[PDB]
Amino acid sequence: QPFIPRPIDTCRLRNGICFPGICRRPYYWIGTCNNGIGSCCARGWRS
């Protein structure tokens, strides 16, 4: 976190990574991907 992580948003803040599975590091889960099985998790950290 170079910037100060504001309140966590959903995948509305999009395009960081879509994982098949889950985000563990460095990636914060923002909503789901692969229509449910994957994870919209943008590269970096929020909260």
d(CA 11, CA 14): 5
**Cα distances (angstroms) measured from residue 21 to each of 3, 32, 34:** 26, 10, 9
d(CA 20, CA 3): 27
**Gap between the terminal Cα atoms of the chain:** 9
The closest of 7, 33, 6 to 41, measured between CA atoms, is: 33
DSSP state of 34: G
Q: Specify whether the CB–CB gap between 38 and 17 falls below 8 A.
A: no
**Cα distances (angstroms) measured from residue 2 to each of 10, 28, 36, 39, 40:** 20, 14, 30, 23, 21
